[PDB]
């Protein structure tokens, strides 16, 4: 499936994922595209900071749903 990672800037990145993908994998996928290290990445959905050892299915994140990215400095 495909999800959208939106920064609060409005900046939207398109990612190809699967429900089995862990947040850890998702962050690595973001690093592969944008180049932001996962260590600086904090992904939020439904207003919860998503944990690395949970999958998109765990968070019930649906096809073409939208994640939020916040940076740690």
């Amino acid at each position: 499936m495909q999800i959208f990672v939106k920064t609060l800037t409005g900046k939207t990145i398109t990612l190809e994922v699967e429900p089995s993908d862990t947040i850890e994998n998702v962050k690595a996928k973001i690093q592969d595209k944008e180049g932001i290290p996962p260590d600086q990445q904090r992904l939020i959905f439904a207003g919860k900071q998503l944990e690395d050892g949970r999958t998109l299915s765990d968070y019930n994140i649906q096809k073409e749903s939208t994640l939020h990215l916040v940076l740690r400095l």
Binding site: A46, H68, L71, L73
Partner: protein, 303 residues
């Protein structure tokens, strides 16, 4: 035939883009095939939500499968095997005929809160409840759950766990809720958003640091005070109580079988089996017919 009563509601993203009745489906959690023969059919929602909670035996020889996986699909269009909708599990058909706590009318379907009194609100009122609260930034932020709301009546321990219930906001308001939740998450984390207009980019600076530079090149990029939100300076900064009673989800016993006509209910599980040996029929408590596929899909269990 099987009655067109349904107990399960989902949110269809395409093309219904609204909340529709849902179909319940099941599989061996191991082979992802339709081969799991359930020991006992589901009776509560917990059975169809908590994973590996329902047990059985996968009929494939290759599987060692012993657990059932429950998925939900739309109940309004031809659904591909891949098209799973998120099941909103607080929504139920108002068979009991109860009253929206906000609007004091019998409506259906309704959303039953997990508050201690199992309060009922209709979806329309729930909508207004979420719309006012969301924009008034009066949504709760539990860092362990996310952005949510409790019982309208303010009951304790009632915060909505499945945050997909907030699709009742509608696409514009839901998308906002997604933003508002992320915004509030950063702030309450002690993080800051960009003060510059057209940026708003969330930042989580070093716990003790007044100098925040909004910075791949994806930053503001602008430096500011973590306090007064100016360019970093070395200088100094600058519900009706009655309607709540009549809106409780708990405020049929036994029926004879269509054959042995001997009286028989297993929790909310609508799958009934005639106990008499010359009978031994599988029948639906609601539909009234012989246990079938549609009955399974529409209302395997009831609330």
């Amino acid at each position: 035939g099987p009655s067109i009563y349904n107990s399960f509601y989902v949110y269809c993203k395409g093309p219904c883009q609204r909340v529709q009745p849902g179909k319940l489906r099941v599989q061996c959690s191991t082979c992802r095939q339709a081969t799991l023969t359930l020991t006992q059919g589901p009776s509560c929602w917990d059975d169809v939500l908590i994973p590996n909670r329902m047990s059985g035996e996968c009929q494939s020889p290759h599987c060692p499968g012993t657990s059932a996986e429950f998925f939900f699909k739309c109940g309004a269009h031809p659904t591909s095997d891949k098209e799973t909708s998120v099941a909103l599990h607080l929504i139920a058909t108002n068979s009991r005929n109860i009253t929206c706590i906000t609007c004091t009318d019998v409506r259906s379907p309704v959303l039953v809160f997990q508050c201690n009194s199992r309060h009922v609100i209709c979806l329309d009122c729930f909508h207004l409840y979420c719309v006012t609260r969301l924009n008034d930034r009066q949504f709760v932020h539990d860092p362990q759950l996310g952005y949510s709301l409790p019982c309208v009546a303010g009951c304790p321990n009632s915060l909505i766990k499945e945050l997909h219930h907030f699709r009742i906001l509608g696409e514009e308001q839901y998308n906002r809720y997604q933003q508002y939740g992320a915004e509030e998450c950063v702030l309450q984390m002690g993080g800051v958003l960009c003060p510059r207009p057209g940026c708003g980019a969330g930042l989580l600076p070093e716990p003790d640091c007044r100098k925040v530079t909004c910075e791949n090149g994806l930053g503001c990029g602008f430096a500011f005070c973590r306090e007064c939100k100016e360019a970093y300076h070395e200088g100094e900064c600058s519900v009706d109580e009655r309607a709540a009673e009549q809106a409780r989800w708990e405020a049929k016993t036994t029926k004879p079988c269509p054959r042995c006509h001997v009286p028989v209910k297993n929790g909310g599980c609508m799958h009934m089996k005639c106990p008499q040996p010359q009978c031994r029929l599988e029948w639906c408590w609601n539909c009234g017919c012989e246990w079938n596929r549609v009955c399974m899909g529409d209302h395997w269990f009831d609330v």
